[PDB]
Amino acid sequence: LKVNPDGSQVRLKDVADVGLGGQDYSINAQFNGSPASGIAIKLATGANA
């Protein structure tokens, strides 16, 4: 990000925390009581269920 006008440099880890997280936190779910996930499938018009 930057180099202190007095040697050394400033890194992303200096200004923020990093890591793998959800791409979106809005939706979430559980199954019977345990953390879970899932894709809902909508049938395509005309296709056979």
Place this chain on the structure above:
Amino acid sequence: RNKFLMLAAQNPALQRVRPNGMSDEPQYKLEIDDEKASALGVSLADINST
């Protein structure tokens, strides 16, 4: 793909087994030390554009 190949060829049921695509060759990687880049007044985006 290399085990597949040198195995299927011990298999008296197949022949002429060739992978279709290409094989990895040597490629000249580039390392850019931004530590000496920012310490030289040279952006970093200007190097890439370069």
